[PDB]
Amino acid sequence: NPWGAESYSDLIAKALKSTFDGRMRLNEIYNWFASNVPYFGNRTSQEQSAGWKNSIRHNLSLHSRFMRIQNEGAGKSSWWVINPDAKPGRNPRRQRSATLE
Numbered sequence: 227n228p229w230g231a232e233s234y235s236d237l238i239a240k241a242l243k244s245t246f247d248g249r250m251r252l253n254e255i256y257n258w259f260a261s262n263v264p265y266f267g268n269r270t271s272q273e274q275s276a277g278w279k280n281s282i283r284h285n286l287s288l289h290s291r292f293m294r295i296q297n298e299g300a301g302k303s304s305w306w307v308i309n310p311d312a313k314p315g316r317n318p319r320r321q322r323s324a325t326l327e
Contacts, residue, residue: 228278229263234285237263238292242308249295251305255282 229237241258242250250258256279259266269275286292291312295305311318 228281229259229265234282235289235291238282238285239308239313246308249297249305249307251303253302 227233237259238255240262241255244250244258245254256266256275259278259282260270260275261267266275266278269278286306291309292306293309295307297303297305310316311322
């Protein structure tokens, strides 16, 4: 990992944690890293950041635990949140995964 031994999801969640109860903008997430991680503060330009953005985006598109929140608006203005049913602290009242036997 470019920042250290922390995992993407470790730091992604920390970023998201700054406004976790609502939404965090995908660009804010990048800004979080750039601000809190010195290495990323060195990578804020388009080509400087694109690769590590691709890394975050790669994981965002692999883990279904990350999900996009619907907002009616086109363009790059997208924002996403971590799936409440895939994060600890609060388990769903109704068991979606109840194991039907």
